[PDB]
Write a protein that binds this ligand. Sequence first.
Ligand code: K
Length: 216
Amino acid sequence: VILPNNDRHQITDTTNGHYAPVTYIQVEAPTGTFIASGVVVGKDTLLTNKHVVDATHGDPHALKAFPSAINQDNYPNGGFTAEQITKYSGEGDLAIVKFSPNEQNKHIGEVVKPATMSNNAETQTNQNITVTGYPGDKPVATMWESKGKITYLKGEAMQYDLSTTGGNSGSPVFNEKNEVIGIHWGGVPNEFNGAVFINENVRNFLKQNIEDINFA
Ligand SMILES: [K+]
């Protein structure tokens, strides 16, 4: 949601640095198109929210992903279709999505370099972070970086003061070292925005379900 701190920048060179794995998501249901975000973390895997996955109504083939999308109809790495979904067993709004290779027999985690996950051993309140993804109040399929600070940490929940809008669901949260520390889910009008914090419980869950995930 939009907050007093509305500090966002557009990323035009999406395949440079840590931006490559940031992904644009489109869930093409027969009732309409749901837009969201996510991040590639393995050869065939990506992370996003449970509510974005629920928009498929149980059919994974309805979920399409375009890594490093620059703008409408400008996808440098093309798109990929989902084949399997696994939801987190805890309360956190988190889900794992596995994709099948594309027409050129390429893997989503091969055309782009998977993101590095943080151990979160030094993460604390008041540190500067960024939430990067695809906000729905901007031109279709454009990547934007939002800047702010962590304001709350408890268990597997985290809150911050930066702005986001519908479309940002599933956007990765990066620390200064450019490692992923959490996954954005949404917020509460005029109060805050929050994400799933990748603590010990969540980390164990990911390692048990993703063979090649990389933790720093
Ligand atoms: K292959």
